[PDB]
């Protein structure tokens, strides 16, 4: 992750720029 | 529309009526020695804007 | 110092006296033009010399004779054409990868207080208000000048 | 029929072709207006044409009947603009000259096609902008 | 085209010179300038040295246009100066304006120094009145 | 600059050549003041408010 928030492609960068179980919020957003 | 078409087309035919004889064209020389009309009607325009 | 090799066309030369009269400074010697400043012309004709070249193409002048005595480009005239088309210059790829290095983090950027202090100190001395009038406007908020638009903006303007 | 702007202009040039203040023009007074404001190049006979076409004294009456008969139909510049930018729908001058000159000689008032294609000579894109065509004839 | 700038409107103020409308200045209309602000037989007949002859409108309004072929509009000398020191004080020593212009625009001599020094006493040169002054704008 | 200074230069040229003309003063320094106020000053007015 920490090397994908220093890559050279600003997307990916983006996509990184910050890193709650998936079931929960599944639930939540239902 | 009609009107300004036709107002279009009178314009033409005055320019047909002169053409272009260089007695116009002296006039129209003359017009930059001559624009106090022209001035008076730029402040006009110009208050009107304001 | 320099023999006559190659010469451009007249009116190159031309323009080049109009921008040398234009930094003449001398009202009725008109003739002679600075001895040392006129490598500074020589900057601003295009050419990029560097400090220990733009000396030995003049002979090692020494500092009165840089600032006091005058001189005729037109003697040197052969001499600036040749450095022009010495190509002793990188490309902006090379310039790129040259300032990459003088980093710490690959961010495609460079710090600006040590870019300054680089380019004054490590290289060719610089005043150093020279150094922030060449980063003005490329210096950002947290100082990371972009290198790359920077040295090409640089070397094409 | 007459616009009094233009009616005052025509009697300002008057005064100022008036320069021997005889209230006539003679040939000394179109010799000295042409060279006051036109070119010293043309230097022929044309003053026997200027005086052959109105021979003898002639006053503002003959010279306003002149430009009336010459000018038939005469219209102020500014209400020529307005009736361009008008009709052009969106008035930025981008009208082409092929179709204003075919709405022209189409739908009202037919005109001869050599004369609109000598007048209109389809200046690009053919964008004639009313401008300049206005400007050309207040102005030469 | 002569009389480009600033005179097009210079044809009312030669109107407003002339009092009994006979196309041009009368010879003894001069006594207006002695009723605009003392005029003697120099005065008088200054006339013939400064007009060929009270002939005509036009020809005297060119004739005193080629004296303003140099005329510029005021507001372009003001930016000039403007641009030429942003501080745009007028504090540049009188001295130093000399020296700039006869090392770079033109090989003023003192016979120009002299004059120019004239035109405005050193305090330096403040370009607020001369560019005032040059087109009398105050 | 060197543009600049030679407008500069030029202005003041044509400003002492009419400086010397005894004629050019008497008219040229009363009229933008009072003559030239009502009917020429008046478009720097009208361009200034605009």
Same mark, same amino acid.
């Given at each position: 992750?920490?090397?994908?928030?220093?890559?050279?492609?600003?997307?990916?960068?983006? $996509?990184?720029?910050?890193?709650?179980?998936?079931?929960?919020?599944?639930?939540?957003?239902? | 529309?009609?009107?300004?078409?036709?107002?279009?087309?009178?314009?033409?035919?005055?320019?047909?009526?002169?053409?272009?004889?260089?007695?116009?064209?002296?006039?129209?020389?003359?017009?930059? $020695?001559?624009?106090?009309?022209?001035?008076?009607?730029?402040?006009?325009?110009?208050?009107?804007?304001? | 110092?320099?023999?006559?090799?190659?010469?451009?066309?007249?009116?190159?030369?031309?323009?080049?006296?109009?921008?040398?009269?234009?930094?003449?400074?001398?009202?009725?010697?008109?003739?002679?033009?600075?001895?040392?400043?006129?490598?500074?012309?020589?900057?601003?004709?295009?050419?990029?010399?560097?400090?220990?070249?733009?000396?030995?193409?003049?002979?090692?002048?020494?500092?009165?004779?840089?600032?006091?005595?005058?001189?005729?480009?037109?003697?040197? &005239?052969?001499?600036?054409?040749?450095?022009?088309?010495?190509?002793?210059?990188?490309?902006?790829?090379?310039?790129?990868?040259?300032?990459?290095?003088?980093?710490?983090?690959?961010?495609?950027?460079?710090?600006?207080?040590?870019?300054?202090?680089?380019?004054?100190?490590?290289?060719?001395?610089?005043?150093?208000?020279?150094?922030?009038? $060449?980063?003005?406007?490329?210096?950002?908020?947290?100082?990371?000048?972009?290198?790359?638009?920077?040295?090409?903006?640089?070397?094409?303007? | 029929?007459?616009?009094?702007?233009?009616?005052?202009?025509?009697?300002?040039?008057?005064?100022?072709?008036?320069?021997?203040?005889?209230?006539?023009?003679?040939?000394?007074?179109?010799?000295?207006?042409?060279?006051? &404001?036109?070119?010293?190049?043309?230097?022929?006979?044309?003053?026997?044409?200027?005086?052959?076409?109105?021979?003898?004294?002639?006053?503002?009456?003959?010279?306003?009947?002149?430009?009336?008969?010459?000018?038939?139909?005469?219209?102020?510049?500014?209400?020529?603009?307005?009736?361009?930018?008008?009709?052009?729908?969106?008035?930025?001058?981008?009208?082409?000259?092929?179709?204003?000159?075919?709405?022209?000689?189409?739908?009202?008032?037919?005109?001869?096609?050599?004369?609109?294609?000598?007048?209109?000579?389809?200046?690009?894109?053919?964008? &004639?902008?009313?401008?300049?065509?206005?400007?050309?004839?207040?102005?030469?």
């Amino acid at each position: 992750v920490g090397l994908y928030q220093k890559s050279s492609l600003k997307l990916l960068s983006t $996509l990184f720029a910050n890193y709650q179980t998936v079931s929960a919020l599944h639930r939540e957003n239902l | 529309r009609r009107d300004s078409l036709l107002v279009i087309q009178w314009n033409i035919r005055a320019f047909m009526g002169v053409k272009n004889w260089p007695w116009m064209k002296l006039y129209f020389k003359i017009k930059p $020695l001559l624009k106090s009309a022209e001035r008076e009607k730029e402040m006009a325009s110009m208050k009107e804007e304001f | 110092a320099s023999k006559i090799k190659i010469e451009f066309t007249p009116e190159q030369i031309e323009e080049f006296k109009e921008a040398f009269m234009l930094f003449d400074r001398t009202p009725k010697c008109e003739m002679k033009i600075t001895y040392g400043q006129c490598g500074d012309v020589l900057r601003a004709l295009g050419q990029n010399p560097t400090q220990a070249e733009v000396l030995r193409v003049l002979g090692k002048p020494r500092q009165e004779e840089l600032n006091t005595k005058m001189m005729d480009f037109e003697t040197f &005239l052969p001499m600036l054409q040749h450095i022009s088309k010495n190509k002793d210059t990188g490309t902006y790829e090379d310039f790129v990868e040259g300032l990459r290095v003088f980093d710490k983090e690959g961010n495609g950027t460079v710090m600006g207080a040590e870019l300054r202090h680089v380019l004054a100190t490590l290289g060719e001395r610089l005043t150093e208000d020279e150094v922030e009038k $060449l980063m003005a406007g490329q210096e950002d908020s947290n100082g990371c000048i972009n290198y790359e638009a920077f040295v090409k903006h640089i070397m094409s303007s | 029929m007459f616009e009094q702007t233009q009616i005052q202009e025509f009697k300002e040039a008057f005064t100022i072709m008036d320069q021997n203040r005889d209230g006539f023009i003679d040939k000394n007074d179109l010799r000295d207006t042409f060279a006051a &404001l036109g070119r010293v190049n043309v230097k022929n006979e044309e003053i026997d044409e200027m005086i052959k076409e109105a021979p003898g004294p002639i006053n503002f009456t003959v010279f306003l009947t002149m430009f009336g008969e010459k000018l038939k139909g005469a219209d102020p510049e500014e209400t020529i603009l307005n009736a361009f930018k008008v009709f052009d729908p969106e008035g930025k001058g981008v009208l082409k000259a092929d179709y204003v000159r075919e709405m022209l000689t189409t739908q009202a008032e037919r005109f001869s096609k050599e004369e609109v294609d000598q007048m209109f000579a389809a200046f690009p894109t053919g964008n &004639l902008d009313y401008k300049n065509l206005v400007h050309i004839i207040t102005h030469g």
